[PDB]
């Protein structure tokens with residue numbers, strides 16, 4: 001599923017991401033835009049052989065099991081394919097664990113490089129929330 005901008009914002013808000021650990025909703029929508037272009041089916045392979053999955057590009061090196069990243073962890077306790085669902089519940093619940101781990105949203109490279117320190121409220125402007 002390729003989300004619309006406001007559609008995703010409303011889904012994220014419903015799942016408790018707005019101001020989660022101090023990160024306003026705009027931060028999450030911006031991250032998803034630049035990580036996956038709002039596409040739940042996005043995958044990208046990393047140099048180390050791990051793979052990033054889904055709308056928030058969660059990495060199989062630490063967070064999910066894909067059966068092909070030897071010596072990796074599965075901290076969210078889910079198969080990586082669960083992160084590709086049109087239902088964002090699994091991605092959100094795992095993201096909540098990631099952002100709580102001490103490094104905040106800096107875990108997401110595209111957030112650090114393209115959202116951090118910008119006017120992120122622009123990403124939810126005009127949305128019925």
Ligand SMILES: [Cl-]
Nearest residue numbers: 021103104105
């Ligand atoms: Cl933080």
